[PDB]
Symmetry: D2
Subunit: 354 residues, 4 copies
Amino acid sequence: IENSAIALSGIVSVANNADNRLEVFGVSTDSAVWHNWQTAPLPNSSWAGWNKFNGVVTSKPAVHRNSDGRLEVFVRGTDNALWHNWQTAADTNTWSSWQPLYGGITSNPEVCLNSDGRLEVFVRGSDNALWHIWQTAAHTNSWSNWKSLGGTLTSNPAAHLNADGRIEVFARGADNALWHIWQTAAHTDQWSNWQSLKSVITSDPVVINNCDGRLEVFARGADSTLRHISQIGSDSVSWSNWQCLDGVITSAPAAVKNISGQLEVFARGADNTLWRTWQTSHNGPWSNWSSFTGIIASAPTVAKNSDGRIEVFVLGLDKALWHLWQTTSSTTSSWTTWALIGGITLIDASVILE
Amino acid sequence: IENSAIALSGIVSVANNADNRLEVFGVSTDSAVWHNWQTAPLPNSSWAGWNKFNGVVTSKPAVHRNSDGRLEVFVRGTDNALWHNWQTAADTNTWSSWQPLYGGITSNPEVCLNSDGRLEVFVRGSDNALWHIWQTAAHTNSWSNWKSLGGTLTSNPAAHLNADGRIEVFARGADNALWHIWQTAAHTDQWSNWQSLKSVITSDPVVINNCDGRLEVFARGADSTLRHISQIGSDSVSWSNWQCLDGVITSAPAAVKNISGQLEVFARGADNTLWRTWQTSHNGPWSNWSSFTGIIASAPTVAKNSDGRIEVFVLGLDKALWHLWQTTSSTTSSWTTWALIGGITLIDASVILE
Amino acid sequence: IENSAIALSGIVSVANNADNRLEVFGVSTDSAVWHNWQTAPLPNSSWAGWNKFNGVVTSKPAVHRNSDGRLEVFVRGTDNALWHNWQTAADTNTWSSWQPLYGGITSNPEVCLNSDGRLEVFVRGSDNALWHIWQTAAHTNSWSNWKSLGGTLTSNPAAHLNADGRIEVFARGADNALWHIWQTAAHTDQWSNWQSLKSVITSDPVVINNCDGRLEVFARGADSTLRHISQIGSDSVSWSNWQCLDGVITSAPAAVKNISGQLEVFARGADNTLWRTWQTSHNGPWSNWSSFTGIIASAPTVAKNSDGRIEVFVLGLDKALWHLWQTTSSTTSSWTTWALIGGITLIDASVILE
Amino acid sequence: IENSAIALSGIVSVANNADNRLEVFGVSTDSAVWHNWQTAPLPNSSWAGWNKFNGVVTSKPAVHRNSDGRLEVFVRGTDNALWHNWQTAADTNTWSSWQPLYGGITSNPEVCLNSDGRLEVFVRGSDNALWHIWQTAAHTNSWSNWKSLGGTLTSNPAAHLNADGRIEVFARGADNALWHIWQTAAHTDQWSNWQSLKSVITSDPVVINNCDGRLEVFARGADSTLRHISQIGSDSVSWSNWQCLDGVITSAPAAVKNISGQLEVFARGADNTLWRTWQTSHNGPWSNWSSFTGIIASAPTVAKNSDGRIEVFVLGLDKALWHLWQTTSSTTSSWTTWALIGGITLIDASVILE
Ligand SMILES: C[C@@H]1O[C@H](O)[C@@H](O)[C@H](O)[C@@H]1O
Ligand SMILES: C[C@@H]1O[C@H](O)[C@@H](O)[C@H](O)[C@@H]1O
Ligand SMILES: C[C@@H]1O[C@H](O)[C@@H](O)[C@H](O)[C@@H]1O
Ligand SMILES: C[C@@H]1O[C@H](O)[C@@H](O)[C@H](O)[C@@H]1O
Ligand SMILES: C[C@@H]1O[C@H](O)[C@@H](O)[C@H](O)[C@@H]1O
Ligand SMILES: C[C@@H]1O[C@H](O)[C@@H](O)[C@H](O)[C@@H]1O
Ligand SMILES: C[C@@H]1O[C@H](O)[C@@H](O)[C@H](O)[C@@H]1O
Ligand SMILES: C[C@@H]1O[C@H](O)[C@@H](O)[C@H](O)[C@@H]1O
Ligand SMILES: C[C@@H]1O[C@H](O)[C@@H](O)[C@H](O)[C@@H]1O
Ligand SMILES: C[C@@H]1O[C@H](O)[C@@H](O)[C@H](O)[C@@H]1O
Ligand SMILES: C[C@@H]1O[C@H](O)[C@@H](O)[C@H](O)[C@@H]1O
Ligand SMILES: C[C@@H]1O[C@H](O)[C@@H](O)[C@H](O)[C@@H]1O
Ligand SMILES: C[C@@H]1O[C@H](O)[C@@H](O)[C@H](O)[C@@H]1O
Ligand SMILES: C[C@@H]1O[C@H](O)[C@@H](O)[C@H](O)[C@@H]1O
Ligand SMILES: C[C@@H]1O[C@H](O)[C@@H](O)[C@H](O)[C@@H]1O
Ligand SMILES: C[C@@H]1O[C@H](O)[C@@H](O)[C@H](O)[C@@H]1O
């Protein structure tokens, strides 16, 4: 791989409804967003079937749950502007249809929920800078004007809350290194300058919080192995050294915190199967990668069910959506084999950043 | 103290709104529930002022946020039945007024949110057994019939979710020991038998989860010191030995998990001031109790703001509500002094269990 | 029990030879010290048989290994002075016989090894103060003059090295509380003032270091349960609160660090059997006490074999020495039943402190 | 670098005497071993001056302390056989002079102390296999015959005790991967088969134990960065994945456990200065490398003083020995600058393995 490569992304975005039922969003061969949902919040539940949102889109959809429980989806439109669509009530399959937020978008959208209940969207703009827009009141369809945070982005952005409620945003920069920028006060439009975390990355950054509040960032490195870095203090400026883990991965990673508070990472491996690694103890060393049977055609997307069981979604070689899950709510649970969520085929609508 | 004593409880119940603004509920000298809320989700925010719900009540109110963000309050009425009252929309100060759930109640109500989004209420019934009633659909005003879980209760119940979504309920039994009972499958009406955790307790039990998922229970013991016990496995049957901490406390304890994932406990101390202890490291040893200036007349009620800062509410000697909070989002932050939330005086409406 | 009680002590002192074979020292009905040793450094080894040191003694013997591997035993003599006896070469059953160190002794002797290789002995003196004497060169029979550290002692002293090489000494004071005093520079005659750790204790203090260097002190409390306190900083002045563990114990405790770095405590329980508790995780909560079959007549003395297996020694109801041990080098190993080390009967020669 | 490279080694071997004074052994321009020692066991002590052992040697010397406190040095002689030399009494500068152990040696010698007090020496033999020889009684000049453990070695061996007393030996194999072999019972001549840990290494392996007993192995990898792997169970067959740390190193690493139980690693960095990294928490993430002023010409050799302070030895550009140390017994202590231990110049006598 080259230093400027961006690893294969996940094929769907997933969210938990207010009642924790999983719901997935993807783009089909008609270039429309389709979605499907569990009928009950357990991994062995039946799924409702694929339902279409009318409208042609030009990016991967991003989904987040509002602070009042309503799902809301963000996508780039045929006019290269930002559009969004929301449930009109929590746990209800009635949606608003696509509404305009304007702007000029050159990446997939990334959504965060501020700790005061307001959604905030981050995108690469037409000048390759980071731009953002936010709800001006919690869970309300009232949005700010577009505002620039500067920088030069060469990946999609990834945002996450710090334990103290400050949003922090990660993105690859013009030098192919990981850069970040952060709110200096919780849920306020007051931001730091851009700072580099060094090290080249060859995937979008993936961010998760560990139980003790500190952010941990995962990405594929220049040698195509997983690497990670973590906060070591109580602010956004104190980080560990980068560490890599042996094993060539061929997609973006996906990280999740399991029931016991330990981190797990899933990625497509060098043999194009799903690979999994987990922390063996608190902050502990990482296990050897374990492989699941079956060739996959996307990065994994990982979610948790209402009983804590982890569930993984991938594109199959038939271009359909497949999933598998843990049989029990336990870190050492066995796993099912891949099962089909049939009815449509999916395309990778990710914005080509070049 | 005697083995059957129940320590002084907190004077208000508190919840975070959908936008994380704190809102407090207490009973005034007119025997009505009054509430007050932050106007913005920060501890130094102004408060809106005390507002009355019409209706005479006969217990401490219990409050929980629905899975769609709406607060809902539960109380015993003048007919000794259960009544409830809800926000009609998230973050909105429009309420339904008191509606009947019937039953015959002989304790304060305790509310939990199942991991499938349904509220569930636990009470001691007219036969001194544990009874419960639940929403039959998430965040919907449709409730089950009353059902008995048996047992003999001599305290109020305390409920908490396990990491795998199973509700577990704790209560003092006829022998003054701590007993518990639990769902054997997440958010399902399938329950274990009652089991004893031994050790006498002289307060209601207080339950919190630690970062690695395991429940930890705090209570005052027969010698009036704080004691605690924790789960050591991945089920509800494997517990540690009881440990006590030196220092006589004169109220129920209140526990909170701070920004760094460590536990903190607040209680009224032997000198009738607020005392605080915290874990010095992960699962680590506990600090000596630290005292805050000022005599208090209730147990503390503890909450967290949108930026992680801890805030504590108590009854003052003037019978009004006072609070103090951390100045910064840091475990070693200094604290403010007591400030008044003036406008009404409060009474302890806790059901007398004798 | 009364506040000034001192719990039953162990009946033998034990040490590892230079080759890690265990060797035990006790006092028989002739008031002489006898010793016995493993013939190979494994718990299932045969023992050599009981051998007598000529000389009448008036205290429990204390044993320590010199920095050149030679065992050295300290005891009070019929003249109430301190006497000692050493192996003339490591792993050799040739001894010097008793030699005088003079002084006037009113407790059992306690021995430490400084981190510069010099033995140092701590005793209560004729004025009830703490006195000490030391080797002036490592592993050499050249000793200092007696020197007082002041204080008023009502238990035997317990000494231990801090991680930075400073000796710290613990003893019960005139108010029945635990007091301590420490070197302010490693292996130097420069000492702090006495400071109180508060809390009454009803046994000698027992001190051990945890893997991260910090000292942890165990003792029986006024209510006859085990209590413990630990250092929380990098100095001798920062300590946690006291914690107790449920369960009445009827002897001094004995603490050991197992193969996995966790602490274990053994004591005679309320039913006069051997009880064991262990930390379930790093610094973690403590297990319920587990009981071994068999009534015992002393506190346990606990040692570790060359392969890490824990071995426990007690006085039986026949007044002989019995032991049991772990079957495998594993924290969850099963244990053998009590086996006799026959040939003599033993008496408790502990100095009566009253 | 190439896959078969072996990084620059340390220029001296170091040991603590029975009284913990440091003593260093190196080879001078006369091809003889010289040694020097602290006069007192503190890093700011004066050193005695360089003293010569008569005899020409052809490897780096290895030193270990016997279980009776006497230092013993092992070296290859002009006849390519193993020779050794010992203190005739602990903490005494009287030595036996070189005595033969015969054999045919093609690596530097590696020494371990079994948990039953017997030294054991590991070498690559004339057939490139691992060979060993041992004391047949603790701290006695009585040795076994030479015995082969097979394998094919392309680095020097590194040996360490497991927590249960089993020796485990690590060495690079014919495929440039790290291999290991272990005793299956403590201090017994019963050994496993060779097993591969995979991953290429470009330095000798460096092994240390962490506080919870588990071995951790450090080495330079094929991309010239530090990598490490650790045991995750209670046996020698369960290991983590390999992890690397960013930063090019140009020598073998040296690892030490600090006063607080955390690991630290020192190595010559890409700019030929001394670099240091440490674990920021238990098992925690690793700090960015920190650099010390001054160009160095060997790997570091790291030791601990009697008060816990870390001290580092290196070859300077003047071909003399320099050292620096911590100013206080604290993990965050500042460090001195390089100071000269003058009197001889040193050569790297490491056996050329090619
Ligand atoms: C998502 C939106 O759907 C509509 O049908 C289109 O007209 C807009 O351009 C946009 O693509
Ligand atoms: C998101 C922002 O929207 C605006 O319309 C553009 O002018 C900016 O370049 C950026 O794309
Ligand atoms: C995000 C950062 O913004 C800056 O403008 C650039 O100089 C860096 O290379 C990076 O692109
Ligand atoms: C991930 C899925 O695994 C299955 O074995 C295949 O049959 C599907 O095509 C898909 O690749
Ligand atoms: C809370 C309810 O308020 C009403 O006013 C009363 O009539 C009911 O009995 C009940 O107390
Ligand atoms: C809560 C339950 O409501 C019912 O009406 C009563 O009959 C039961 O005893 C119990 O009080
Ligand atoms: C809750 C428990 O229920 C049982 O019926 C009683 O026997 C116990 O004492 C306790 O009250
Ligand atoms: C808790 C409050 O502290 C203050 O100092 C007092 O003035 C109030 O009456 C109340 O006791
Ligand atoms: C231990 C010593 O043994 C000797 O036999 C006695 O004479 C001394 O008084 C002392 O008791
Ligand atoms: C150990 C000391 O020895 C001396 O001889 C006595 O005078 C002191 O009181 C103390 O007993
Ligand atoms: C050891 C301490 O020494 C002091 O003299 C006493 O005042 C304390 O009570 C305690 O005995
Ligand atoms: C500890 C030993 O346990 C055995 O069962 C007894 O027979 C001995 O007398 C002794 O009490
Ligand atoms: C170390 C030994 O020193 C002696 O002088 C030599 O004769 C031997 O060959 C060997 O080198
Ligand atoms: C160490 C061993 O010594 C023996 O003499 C040789 O024959 C072997 O090959 C090996 O070198
Ligand atoms: C140490 C190991 O021994 C075996 O013989 C070899 O096959 C491996 O490559 C490695 O050298
Ligand atoms: C390590 C030492 O650092 C010093 O600055 C130099 O002067 C010496 O030559 C040597 O390189």
